[PDB]
Structures are given as C-alpha cells and as structure tokens.
Design a protein around this ligand. Structure first.
Ligand SMILES: Nc1ncnc2c1ncn2[C@@H]1O[C@@H]2CO[P@@](=O)(S)O[C@@H]3[C@H](F)[C@@H](CO[P@@](=O)(S)O[C@H]2[C@H]1F)C[C@H]3n1cnc2c(=O)[nH]cnc21
Ligand SMILES: Nc1ncnc2c1ncn2[C@@H]1O[C@@H]2CO[P@@](=O)(S)O[C@@H]3[C@H](F)[C@@H](CO[P@@](=O)(S)O[C@H]2[C@H]1F)C[C@H]3n1cnc2c(=O)[nH]cnc21
Lengths: 193, 193
C-alpha cells in the first residue's frame, strides 16, 4: 500500500483521491476506533469529525474525516497504522490535538473549481446561514427576506460551514443570493493551519 | 401544531418547510423509534431512510427522512403520532411498505430550481456515477476520461442518486460533464408514486 501526500506534490489523478492523499488503495477509515503512529496508540474521537480538503489542478477534494486525539506533534506524511500493523493512511491535517484520518470517510464534496471559488467557515453554535454569511437567526431571517425577490444567477462561490451540531454547504450568485444548500447531520471541526 | 400537505396546496412560505409538509413546528424526527397512525404502532427502520422531496414555487425541498414499516395502505395527510398522543407529522411519501416520517431529518438539499432541473435515480449497488449516468465502474471510468477534456459549462441539472449503501448528488452542464459530487454516507430508498 502506497500513500502520497498532496502537500508534497504527490497528487496523482489516476490514484484514489482523498483529502491530502493520493493512494493505491481505498481504505474505509470509518471502521477504526484506535490507530497507531510510530508505535503509539491514539483513540478515534466519537461523533465528531474533521472537514479536510486538498486543492490540486482546479480540483477540490473534501470530506468529513475521522480524527484521533494526540498531544504529540505529528507531521504531514507520518504513517498511520492499525493495531495489526498495516499502514492505512498518512498524517494530513490537524486541529490542535486532533489529527485527521484520511481515506474513505463520511460526507464528501468533489468540485471542479473552474470559474468558482470555495470558502470554509467555522459555524458558531446557534447561528443561521444565508449565502456567504452567518449571523443570529433574527439577522439572517431578514437578510433572507430581502434577498428573496432577487432573480437567482449562476453559482460563482461555494461556502462550507462546519459546526458542532451540523455542517452545511451553500452556493451564491454574484449578488450573494443563496442558490443551493446541503446539510450534513454531523458535528466537526476545521483544520487549523 | 398544524401540518399542511404540499400535495393539497398546503405550502406556506412563512412556515417550516419539510418534504411534503409545511408546519408551524420543527420536529426532530431522527429520535423516534416507534410511531402511531390511527392507534396502530409502527417501527422506524434502523439505518435506512427515504429520500423525499416536494417542489413548490420553483423551490426544491429534499431530505433523507426516517421511515416506518406498515402493511396497511396510508394516505397523504394521515396524522402521525408519537407514543404519548402528540402529533409529530403526517403521511407524505411511501415506498412499498415503507412510509416517510417528514420533519427535521438527516442530509437535506434545498435548491432554487430557476434555470435548472433535478432528477432522481435508484443507484444500483456496486455501480459508479459520473455526471448524469450510472454504470459499472470500468464503463464509468471510461466515460469520465472522454468527458475529461470537454470544457466545463454552466450547471443545468442536478441528479440525486439513492442507493442501499451510499447516496449522492451531482451537477452537470449541457454535455453531461460533472461539476460537483456530494456523497451522503447513508443508505436509503426513493418513494414509489
Ligand atoms: N425559526 C427559528 N427560530 C429560531 N431559531 C431558529 C429558527 N430556525 C433556525 N434557527 C436557528 O438557526 C440554526 C440553523 O438552523 P438550520 O436552518 S442551518 O437547520 C437546522 C439544523 F439542521 C437543526 C437544528 O440546528 P440548531 O437548532 S443547533 O440551529 C438552528 C437554530 F439555532 C435542524 C434544522 N432546521 C431547523 N429548522 C428547520 C426547518 O424549518 N427546515 C429544515 N431544517 C430545519
Ligand atoms: N477504483 C475502483 N475500483 C473498483 N470499483 C470502484 C472503484 N471506485 C469505485 N468503485 C465502485 O463504484 C461504487 C461507487 O463508488 P463511489 O465513487 S459513490 O465512492 C465509494 C462509496 F462512497 C463507498 C462504497 O461504495 P461501493 O464500494 S458499495 O461501490 C463503489 C464500487 F462498487 C466507497 C467510496 N469510495 C471508493 N473509492 C473511493 C475513492 O477513491 N474516493 C472516495 N470514495 C471512494
């Protein structure tokens, strides 16, 4: 099994594509509760995930990935093993002491970035979203009321909203009108560069 | 608590909107495991759902919803109760002996249909998807290569792929070239008219 890091130019379109990784195998990483890095065991976080993305050659590869808690600092490319000793992934992204387990995970977004932009936001708990902005529901409700009569235009930007209780993807036209919204019913965090 | 069926002209833009229903309340229906219709108890199916949608005023309202198994024929508008006599929903959609429990559910898709169409397909287990078609993976891999060069045009159609092991949403241009792919890691069925 080979795992190549996109952060080091390892992207290969003819290989399986996951956030941060081009691989010769497609491992279902949802099935692991414990992982090992340099012979140290780390527990997978239950019911909270990490939204990770790589962006190569105008291709956006995003997905909610499992994550394990590790107080030690790990670097991009460190091999991740199961308890039997098989390498299942490489270290890609971290949020403080959370590290993404990159592979076939939960909800995913694959997008061609030609002519559009994509932006990621931490969704504050209880806030609503309209288009490219979040705020309190009362502020959002009226923003929606005034943007309603606008004739929708073509999508020009995607916005990914990652919250503790829900995740969402929205799209907007040039005027900021919300064209489409998808929700994922999972809680997660975004990587911290 | 009022539940109005979109099928009977019950859509109210100022009410909460769910597949087939406009309601004065917003019930989280993921929590119920048993419901009651006309004083008969029915079990909610575990780990499999129903993708349901209504389309009103150029608005698409789709969601993955819980379903309960019931051999009696039920009709749109039949009140659905919890085990404490509280009404929580109304019958909207059916798949053979599966009946949707509409409300706040799992993954959702909200879309302004202005200028675009949307289509739903039963994803055959083990089939792959590119753009507007499903087929065996090797055939799909070839279709992707043939469409690889074609210049990406405006999104004109959404396609909802509902399978036993995964659900997906794709967007395509006029040629059928794939713009976006979103995966929902849930199994589900589609209503049968
Ligand atoms: N009328 C309101 N009065 C006061 N506060 C409101 C109202 N509406 C929304 N908020 C607030 O805004 C946030 C975003 O909610 P949102 O639309 S993104 O979706 C939410 C989440 F997926 C989940 C709960 O989310 P939560 O409670 S932690 O946060 C909410 C809340 F804090 C259920 C979804 N859900 C809620 N209502 C509908 C609906 O009618 N249709 C489809 N799904 C719906
Ligand atoms: N290379 C291949 N060789 C042979 N057959 C293949 C290959 N690729 C796909 N198929 C077939 O097509 C179906 C849909 O696959 P899809 O693209 S929707 O993604 C699938 C589903 F989400 C989940 C279960 O699907 P399942 O196993 S029952 O069916 C598959 C399979 F029958 C695993 C996901 N998954 C697989 N690989 C990747 C990847 O590289 N990235 C992100 N997710 C990936």
């Amino acid at each position: 099994a080979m795992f190549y890091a996109h952060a080091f130019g390892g992207y290969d379109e003819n290989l399986h594509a996951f956030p941060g990784i081009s691989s010769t195998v497609a491992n279902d990483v949802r099935k692991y509760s414990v992982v090992s890095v340099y012979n140290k065991k780390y527990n997978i976080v239950k019911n909270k995930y990490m939204w990770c993305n790589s962006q190569v050659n105008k291709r956006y590869i995003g997905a909610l990935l499992p994550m394990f808690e590790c107080n030690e600092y790990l670097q991009i490319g460190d091999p991740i093993h199961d308890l039997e000793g098989n390498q299942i992934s490489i270290v890609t992204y971290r949020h403080k002491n959370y590290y993404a387990l990159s592979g076939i995970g939960y909800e995913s977004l694959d997008l061609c970035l030609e002519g559009v932009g994509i932006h990621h936001h931490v969704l504050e708990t209880g806030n609503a979203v309209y288009g490219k902005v979040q705020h309190e529901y009362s502020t959002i409700k009226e923003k929606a009321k005034e943007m309603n009569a606008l004739k929708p235009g073509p999508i020009i930007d995607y916005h990914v909203w990652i919250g503790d209780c829900v995740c969402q993807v929205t799209t907007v036209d040039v005027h900021g009108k919300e064209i489409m919204r998808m929700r994922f019913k999972r809680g997660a965090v975004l990587p911290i560069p």
